[PDB]
Amino acid sequence: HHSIALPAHLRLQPIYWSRDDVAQWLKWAENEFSLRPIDSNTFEMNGKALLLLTKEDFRYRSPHSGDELYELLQHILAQARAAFDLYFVLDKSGSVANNWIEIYNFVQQLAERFVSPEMRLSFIVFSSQATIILPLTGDRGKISKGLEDLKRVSPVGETYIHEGLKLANEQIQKAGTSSIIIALTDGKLDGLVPSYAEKEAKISRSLGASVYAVGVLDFEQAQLERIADSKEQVFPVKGGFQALKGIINSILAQS
C-alpha cells in the first residue's frame, strides 16, 4: 500500500536518510500539508537520529507542525519497506587466514548498517566444504550470535565457492523480497571451480538474486566480475567506508 504519496527521493527507509534528506522531507511536508514555514535546521541530524526522538521532541522543535511531522514520519515508516534477504558467502580458506578479520569486520559493519526491519541476514562460510553459520533471520539476537561464531572461525582449506553459493541459492529458493548475495573472497579458484562458481552464480540470478563480490587481499577482479552481476557490483574490502557505503546504496537501490 501507499496511503502517503511520498516522493521518490524520500521513499528510502528513514534510517538511511541523511541530514539533507531530513531537510528535504521538511520542505516536502511543508507544502504537501500546507504547514507553516519550517526552518531547515529544526532537525539538524540524519534520519537515524530523527527516529530516536520523541513526539514531545517534535512538539518542542516545531510548535506549529511537530505533532504532524511525527505522525507523518510514522506513516512513512509503515510504508517504506526493506524486504532484503542478505546472504554473506564468506571465504574461510587457508589462503585468507591472515585476512579473516577483514572479512569479519566488513560483514559485522554491514550487519550494523543493515539493521532496518524486514531485512534478514544469513552467514555462509566455505572452504573445502560449505557451512551455514547463520540461517536467514531478522532476529538481531541470532544475528549478534552469528557474528560471534564468525569471529571464532579458524580459516583453513581450499576455495570451493560454488559450495557456498549453493547454500545461498537453496535458501533463496526455499524462501521464495530482494535476495542479495555478498561473496567475500580473493577469487583465486583452482581447477574447474571457476566454471563451477560462475555456473552457480547464473542460478542465483536465475532465482532473482543480485550477486555482489567483495575482494580481499590481491583478488582477481576478473574472476569476481564474472561471479558478480557486473563490474559495478565488485568492491574492495580495503575501500573502507566508501565501499561499505557503495554496496549498501547499491543494494538499497536494487529494490
Author numbering: 10 to 185, 189 to 267
What wording appears in the published article?
No twinning, pseudo-translation or TELSAM-polymer flipping was detected in diffraction data sets from these SUMO tag-free constructs. The interface of vWa with the vWa domain of an adjacent polymer buries 188 Å2 of solvent-accessible surface area. Specifically, the side chain of Gln138 in the vWa domain interacts with the side chain of Asn114 in the adjacent vWa domain. Additionally, the side chains of Glu111 and Asn107 in the vWa domain interact with the side chains of Pro144 and Thr140 in the adjacent vWa domain. The vWa domain also contacts a second vWa domain, burying 144 Å2 of solvent-accessible surface area. Specifically, the side chain of Ser207 in the vWa domain makes weak contacts with the side chain of Ala265 in this second vWa domain. Prior to cooling, this crystal was briefly (∼10 s) exposed to iodine vapour to label exposed tyrosine side chains. We were also able to resolve the main-chain atoms of two of the histidine residues in the 10×His tag. In the constructs reported here, retaining the 10×His tag during crystallization clearly did not block crystal formation and may have improved the crystal order by limiting the possible binding modes of the target protein to its host TELSAM polymer.
The ‘TELSAM’ variant of the human translocation ETS leukaemia (TEL) protein sterile alpha motif (SAM) domain is a 75-amino-acid (9 kDa) polymer-forming crystallization chaperone that is soluble at pH > 8. However, when the pH decreases below 7, TELSAM forms a six-subunit-per-turn helical polymer that can enable fused target proteins to co-crystallize. TELSAM reduces the entropic cost of crystal nucleation and growth by pre-freezing some degrees of freedom in the crystal lattice. Additionally, pre-ordering many thousands of copies of the target protein along the polymer results in substantial avidity to strengthen the subsequent target protein–target protein interactions that are formed when adjacent TELSAM polymers associate.
